[model samples]
Target chain A: YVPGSVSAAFVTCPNEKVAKEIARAVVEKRLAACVNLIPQITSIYEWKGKIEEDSEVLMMIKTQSSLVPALTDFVRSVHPYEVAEVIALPVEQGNFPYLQWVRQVT
Target chain B: SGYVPGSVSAAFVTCPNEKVAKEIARAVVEKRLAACVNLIPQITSIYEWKGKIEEDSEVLMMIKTQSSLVPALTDFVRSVHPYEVAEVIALPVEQGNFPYLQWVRQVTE
Candidate 1:
């Protein structure tokens, strides 16, 4: 289960390197407690009147809901693509102490 | 405009999808440009694109950098960005402390 303060957002990158750069930015800024990078995601989507498929890296961002706007803007500003993917999900439930630690870390 | 003098701070951003966000993040970090990044998932967005109203789930990232690195960062981001026009902006940070500011400068170099 997801924690109350712990939320998740997903953004796809062209490759692993992009994902890593984003992770570094978030953590360094202390905007997020931490970032989990999921590599080699097989994605199928539509673009330019065609269905596309490829392997991509997915980011699992952990942070407070209140901070969503700033975080979202940061991603968009530096994103390589015009319409980059950025979404946030509320954490329904999770371990108390661990979630608290996330707050402390960021 | 250029990077603000003696300004070291962090800002937030979002992506249309996971793939694009990941690539941008990699570029910043590999260059030792950003100290850290946080990736958020499953964000529902409501906005205007190409003169049409659309909705999608996206990933948001908060990026940290030194003021001196903004020019380099912007150039680097544009070089690898897939979009003809990508969103890259900055804001002024207010009321921070000496230790934390020093910490930010220390980590990047």
Candidate 2:
């Protein structure tokens, strides 16, 4: 199936409070159509010389590609992490009306 | 049977490799700084790096600890974390049973 051309944004929050703040900021700024907050995620990665793991919140952001630059900038500026996770994915297909709703809401 | 005096929170971070993630997680857990930690496998990430765009797959980490420990927790992560800066953010726990909260308190303390 062809992608819808919609963009997805991903962010990792230190906690629920930060998660909410990031979501509110993006929506208030109209940076994206909507944002999905995933709470209580367990993450593991490499650091220094050993394996590391921690619990964090993950944010799923849905918006248009056109507005990605603005959204990315906002997260980077406001994010507490030295380098926050603000990535985008292309949506091949979605409901036209829903997509319209995203554009309007964001 | 008892009351939990404080709250519990969690944070998830992604790093370039498993080694670094494990080190950070280990330090926190070993110090009894965090209640628990879970390290997951690597995943592909796509985003803008500097002026140009880039894509890289990295490891993700989940940190579970008390709210009071956040400051120390982040400080530890920052000291050893790579990639300019590590993604460290806190998410509040709005809903949870009393017993679980108590368990968290016991573990951290």
Candidate 3:
């Protein structure tokens, strides 16, 4: 069961500390109702001419689609990364009550 | 130009443990239901199920696949999962690496 009103915002932080800071900011500002952090994830990409594996934290923020811009602006204000990863996925379906909570909170 | 964002999606599912998570991922990949499944272990999930609020640690699986096959993928997962109701909610991928998205399309039917 999912709602068309909510969107899931995904972001990757350099570390757990940075992830929490971003997560808290969005929630505190009511840009997001809740945020879940995956402790560590191995991100593989090429840096310069060589490949690099970096450990990062994945943060999932649940909010309405309309707030993504405000959320992104708030994140960039505090983020250390030159180009932060802030992507939104359209949530097709989810728990009704939980989804409703997300809409009401934000 | 980037591939069609609505075609592919990243589905989220929470499993009881590493063993169960691996099993589902392997099955989905084998069946061409997903291109990749990233297991996030040692994660805490706090939510209300039924009438009680359940707080526990679980492995969350991020399954990358096409949006079209979400229903099939969900059915396959629920059929094999131990839980009575498995969580297989999918979110449409708004954008991503074009090459990576193409690979996912190529690998799955």
Candidate 4:
């Protein structure tokens, strides 16, 4: 059920307000077919040589692999983070109908 | 220096609730099917089901393990999952923190 055309992009937002705004913008512009917001994630990492832990919302963007750059660029233009986490993972396998739906939408 | 064939694999499962998500995560990690599980406590899923578009709140689990364990992990999840048709997606991880990757290899080994 895995399709070669789709990719899942991950981005961490500072809060729900910013997360929803980015999600709406991406879907509205067709940069992403769908954006799922997962809120209140506890992230622990090092920033500027100091350990930091904070609550952040994660945006999962489902789109074509080729659109990753454009998607990330669009996110950066509106994102508040000094450096946002934008990473993509291959959709190795999924439901055929669901995958097809994603392809059709984007 | 970071490139290696032993790159990790990730399994994504969307569960109906946090209870089910926790159950699956506990089982897989205890059984060594995964080194660790990252649970996204709340997610909104919009999709079609039985010819109708539906919206539901779900929990997303990201299981980190090796490529070889994917098959067994999938089988294990399917066996414990309540849904007749559950979403179990596997993705190959090309790169990651070396120490974290090694930790995964060790825990799952």
Per-residue lDDT tens digits for candidate 1, residues B1-86, read 23334377454555667898898898788787776767776654332334443445567666776766755766676667664544
Q: Backbone clashes per model, in order?
A: 73, 47, 3, 0
Error of 3 at B67 (Å): 1.2
TM, every model: 0.47, 0.51, 0.62, 0.66
Candidate 4 whole-model C-alpha lDDT, 0 to 1: 0.79
Which regions of candidate 2 deviate over 4 angstroms? A1-106, B1-6
Q: List ranges where model 1 is wrong by over 4 Å.
A: A1-3, B1-109
**Using TM-score as the measure, which candidate wins?**
4
User: lDDT tens string, model 2, A1-106?
Assistant: 1233566668888887887777776766678655555567888888898887889988767787788989999899999989888887654333344456556555
* Each model's fraction of native contacts: 0.00, 0.00, 0.24, 0.39
- Per residue, candidate 4 scores C-alpha lDDT tens digits across A1-106 of 5444778899999898888778877776777766677877899998799999999988787887778889989998999987889998777754444456666666
For candidate 3 chain B, the 10 contiguous residues with the lowest summed lDDT are B46-55
Which candidate do you rate higher for TM-score, 2 or 4?
4
Docking class of 4: acceptable
State the C-alpha RMSD over the true interface residues for candidate 1, after superposing those residues.
16.3
- Per-residue error at B28 for model 4, in Å? 3.9
lDDT of each residue in B5-86, candidate 2, tens digit only = 3367665566778888888888888888787788776344333334333445577677777877876777777667785555
Model 3 DockQ, alpha carbons vs. true complex: 0.20
Q: Top DockQ: which candidate number? A: 4
Cα error, residue B90 of model 3, in Å, equals 1.5
DockQ for candidate 4, please give it. Answer: 0.28
> Could you give the candidate ranking by TM-score, starting with the highest?
4, 3, 2, 1
lDDT (Cα, tens digit) per residue for candidate 1, span A68-99: 78888999988887988998766433334435
